[PDB]
Amino acid sequence: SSYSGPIVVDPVTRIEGHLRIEVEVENGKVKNAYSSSTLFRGLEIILKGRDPRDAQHFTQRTCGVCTYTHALASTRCVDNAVGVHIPKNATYIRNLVLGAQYLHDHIVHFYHLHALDFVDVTAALKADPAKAAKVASSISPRKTTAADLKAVQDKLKTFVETGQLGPFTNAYFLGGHPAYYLDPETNLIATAHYLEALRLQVKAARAMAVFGAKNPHTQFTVVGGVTCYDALTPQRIAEFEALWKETKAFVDEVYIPDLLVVAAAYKDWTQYGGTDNFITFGEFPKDEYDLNSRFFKPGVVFKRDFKNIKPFDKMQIEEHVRHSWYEGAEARHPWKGQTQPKYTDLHGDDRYSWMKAPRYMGEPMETGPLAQVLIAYSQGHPKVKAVTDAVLAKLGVGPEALFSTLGRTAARGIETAVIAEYVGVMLQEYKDNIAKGDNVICAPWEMPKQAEGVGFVNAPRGGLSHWIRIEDGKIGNFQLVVPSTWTLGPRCDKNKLSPVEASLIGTPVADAKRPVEILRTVHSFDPCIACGVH
Amino acid sequence: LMGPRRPSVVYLHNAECTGCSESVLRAFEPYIDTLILDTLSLDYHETIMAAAGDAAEAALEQAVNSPHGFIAVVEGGIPTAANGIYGKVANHTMLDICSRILPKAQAVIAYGTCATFGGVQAAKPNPTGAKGVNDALKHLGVKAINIAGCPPNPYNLVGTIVYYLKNKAAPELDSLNRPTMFFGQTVHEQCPRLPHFDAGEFAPSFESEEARKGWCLYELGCKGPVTMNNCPKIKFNQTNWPVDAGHPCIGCSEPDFWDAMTPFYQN
Numbered sequence: 020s021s022y023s024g025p026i027v028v029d030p031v032t033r034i035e036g037h038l039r040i041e042v043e044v045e046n047g048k049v050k051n052a053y054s055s056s057t058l059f060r061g062l063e064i065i066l067k068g069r070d071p072r073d074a075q076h077f078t079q080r081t082c083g084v085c086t087y088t089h090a091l092a093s094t095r096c097v098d099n100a101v102g103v104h105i106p107k108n109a110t111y112i113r114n115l116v117l118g119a120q121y122l123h124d125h126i127v128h129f130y131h132l133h134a135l136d137f138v139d140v141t142a143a144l145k146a147d148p149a150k151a152a153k154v155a156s157s158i159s160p161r162k163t164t165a166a167d168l169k170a171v172q173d174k175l176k177t178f179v180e181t182g183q184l185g186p187f188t189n190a191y192f193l194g195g196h197p198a199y200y201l202d203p204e205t206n207l208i209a210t211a212h213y214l215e216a217l218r219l220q221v222k223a224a225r226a227m228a229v230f231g232a233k234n235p236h237t238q239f240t241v242v243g244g245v246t247c248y249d250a251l252t253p254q255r256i257a258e259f260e261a262l263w264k265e266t267k268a269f270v271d272e273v274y275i276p277d278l279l280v281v282a283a284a285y286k287d288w289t290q291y292g293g294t295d296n297f298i299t300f301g302e303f304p305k306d307e308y309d310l311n312s313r314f315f316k317p318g319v320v321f322k323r324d325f326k327n328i329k330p331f332d333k334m335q336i337e338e339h340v341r342h343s344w345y346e347g348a349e350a351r352h353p354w355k356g357q358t359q360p361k362y363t364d365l366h367g368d369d370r371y372s373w374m375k376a377p378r379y380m381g382e383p384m385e386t387g388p389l390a391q392v393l394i395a396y397s398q399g400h401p402k403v404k405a406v407t408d409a410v411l412a413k414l415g416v417g418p419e420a421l422f423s424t425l426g427r428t429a430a431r432g433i434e435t436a437v438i439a440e441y442v443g444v445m446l447q448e449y450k451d452n453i454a455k456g457d458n459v460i461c462a463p464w465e466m467p468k469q470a471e472g473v474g475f476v477n478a479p480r481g482g483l484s485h486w487i488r489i490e491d492g493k494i495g496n497f498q499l500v501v502p503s504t505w506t507l508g509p510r511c512d513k514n515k516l517s518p519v520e521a522s523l524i525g526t527p528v529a530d531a532k533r534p535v536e537i538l539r540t541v542h543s544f545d546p547c548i549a550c551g552v553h
Numbered sequence: 554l555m556g557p558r559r560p561s562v563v564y565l566h567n568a569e570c571t572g573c574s575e576s577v578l579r580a581f582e583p584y585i586d587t588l589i590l591d592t593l594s595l596d597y598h599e600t601i602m603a604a605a606g607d608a609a610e611a612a613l614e615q616a617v618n619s620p621h622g623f624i625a626v627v628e629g630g631i632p633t634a635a636n637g638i639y640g641k642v643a644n645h646t647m648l649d650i651c652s653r654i655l656p657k658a659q660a661v662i663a664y665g666t667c668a669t670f671g672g673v674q675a676a677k678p679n680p681t682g683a684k685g686v687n688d689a690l691k692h693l694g695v696k697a698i699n700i701a702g703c704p705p706n707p708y709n710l711v712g713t714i715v716y717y718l719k720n721k722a723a724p725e726l727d728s729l730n731r732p733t734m735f736f737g738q739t740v741h742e743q744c745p746r747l748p749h750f751d752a753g754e755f756a757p758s759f760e761s762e763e764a765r766k767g768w769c770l771y772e773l774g775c776k777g778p779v780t781m782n783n784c785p786k787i788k789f790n791q792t793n794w795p796v797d798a799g800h801p802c803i804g805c806s807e808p809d810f811w812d813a814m815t816p817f818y819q820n
């Protein structure tokens with residue numbers, strides 16, 4: 020019958036970094052999958068022996084998509100190792116830059132990385148812009164007119180008629196494709212908003228630079244707090260607040276309504292891409308030394324048992340190498356980590372990736388927006404509960420819909436909406452604290468000769484941790500365990516498929532030469548291979 | 554993907570963190586939509602292109618072999634150790650990919666310190682043998698214009714492309730092959746804290762009242778005096794730059810800065 024045989028997708032585009040996905044398909048459905056990360060840099064090797072204060076500048080260059088997040092994780096890690104308790108204002112400013120990062124990151128992911136799996140941009144040219152404008156105005160309080168959308172259509176028409184399709188060259192939707200479902204008018208609205216998002220994200224990123232010097236790769240964190248005395252001024256706070264407000268409006272008025280319209284059209288995608296286990300670290304602390312003080316709390320769930328959320332024990336993480344291109348087969352806790360590259364080529368000695376395979380109590384764990392949202396929901400988080408219930412009700416689906424590619428994509432929008440609102444709460448608290456006369460942003464500290472430290476960040480892709488062993492006041496060991504490592508790393512020495520590999524089993528493939536269904540699931544995890552491998 | 558009227562750009566990703574690609578998305582006046590729809594034809598770019606896998610490979614071959622010619626923009630260092638094995642795309646080493654494609658380009662721009670000078674993965678002990686593009690490909694005659702920084706100011710990329718399209722040639726380049734129109738001044742000579750430097754008014758710590766008052770960050774490690782870039786002039790995101798945020802320059806537009814400029818908090 021249908022296709023039986025291998026499919027390889029190399030490069031996987033519209034991700035960060037260098038990913039090769041291999042699947043075996045039987046009768047048009049995926050029966051096996053391998054997640055192969057094909058670039059190694061070795062930042063952990065490079066850090067050895069250096070000044071712990073330098074680590075955040077190197078590790079920030081783990082990734083420029085999730086920029087700032089590694090600087091924050093390393094600074095939390097060295098703050099922890101030195102035993103410094105940073106001032107309240109440093110926590111606020113660090114938290115505000117992080118909230119801005121999530122909004123930038125998720126908006127770009129949905130439009131610029133994910134949406135071409137679901138939107139036929141060329142079909143937008145046949146749409147009726149008056150009909151499209153009525154649809155757009157019914158899903159958003161933002162009023163869109165026929166002329167608004169005709170402007171987009173005319174621009175796209177001129178682009179396509181030049182024959183230079185640029186980033187749309189060889190798109191899987193060109194010519195039509197059976198797994199693309201949208202009508203012309205919905206394709207035109209999504210395309211209009213893709214283009215709009217290209218300029219809105221400039222403002223979303225600018226918000227990070229107001230306090231954080233620049234985007235990408237911020238430069239305002241130090242051990243002990245932050246450096247940006249200008250961030251205390253009413254002028255910088257007003258500039259941030261105006262950019263945040265505009266970004267939140269876009270989230271609420273453009274991204275979430277689009278996400279819901281697309282999800283409604285692709286409701287069969289509730290049936291693919293599910294996973295069993297979830298881990299999240301919590302984010303936006305009131306207390307840098309207490310994860311349970313975070314607005315989102317840490318937690319662990321096995322086999323979708325959300326009635327029995329397990330506390331997160333940081334000692335139950337081990338990183339496997341048996342199916343990775345490193346020496347040997349021994350899993351290691353990151354305070355005893357090892358990064359000893361040894362390449363065997365694809366499936367040589369059963370090894371096929373430069374990512375290690377993190378396991379929690381021996382199990383493969385999804386992390387990222389779906390873990391953060393589901394675990395916060397199950398902890399009774401009122402804001403997460405209110406918008407996930409509203410999203411479920413709009414879509415007319417039950418909560419089991421969330422254990423899927425569609426649900427993961429929706430969770431990314433839910434977390435964006437919730438964080439966009441919480442950034443305003445954080446901003447008010449920050450303003451309040453300045454008004455009490457607290458203008459301190461950095462605290463003094465001393466470097467110990469020997470210490471261990473760990474820093475935890477829940478980044479846009481999930482639980483990030485940096486682990487340091489200080490020896491003679493220098494980096495004796497520095498290990499990064501990154502969200503995409505959890506999600507997209509390979510099998511472990513118990514041969515358990517990782518979340519992305521397992522989630523791919525059962526994927527239908529209508530056309531093996533244009534396997535957009537594989538990209539829909541892989542992209543729903545928002546892979547970052549520079550992150551996962553470092 | 555191309556042919557006609559807009560100049561073709563092939564954008565390659567080697568050993569990189571994608572911060573340089575992100576920096577281009579921050580392009581301002583012109584913005585990135587103007588750049589991709591009006592100015593240029595972006596014919597290959599793994600971060601945002603629609604095609605994947607074989608379809609993406611075919612898009613790349615069509616662009617590189619075009620009789621109309623293409624410009625290459627390259628992000629990331631080339632890993633050369635172990636015969637290039639540490640970095641592959643479509644199961645080809647990055648070294649082989651770049652060796653085959655870049656000699657066919659009408660012009661090559663190395664964008665970001667990794668592509669220009671080797672960058673973060675080339676820092677000691679350089680396990681993957683990462684090299685900048687011109688070092689890696691010297692023997693093939695490749696001479697990329699180097700636009701340095703980690704990441705660079707995207708103003709400097711668009712300014713170099715526009716110059717090239719107008720004048721059919723590279724602008725004046727310094728001895729590191731960087732355009733002098735952007736890299737001809739130290740960041741220090743342009744810095745607002747220079748009067749404090751001259752007066753020997755240095756912040757002794759980040760928590761100090763001197764730091765609050767905006768005194769010079771040289772004692773806290775600032776590499777402004779040895780770094781060529783236009784940061785204080787152009788700023789980033791139309792609003793800020795490191796020492797206006799209170800933090801020293803870490804020298805990120807300079808070759809080997811990860812080893813030359815460290816420890817970052819010492820001078």
Ligand code: SF4
Binds near residue numbers: 569668672705
């Ligand atoms: S130059 Fe810096 S920002 Fe650009 S790819 Fe390299 S590490 Fe990333």
Ligand code: SF4
Binds near residue numbers: 769778796
């Ligand atoms: S802060 Fe840095 S760039 Fe500015 S005057 Fe001092 S040493 Fe120079």
Ligand code: F3S
Binds near residue numbers: 702703780795796805
């Ligand atoms: S760190 Fe880099 S961004 Fe400019 S201020 Fe120094 S050259």
Ligand SMILES: [Mg+2]
Binds near residue numbers: 499500552
């Ligand atoms: Mg690691």
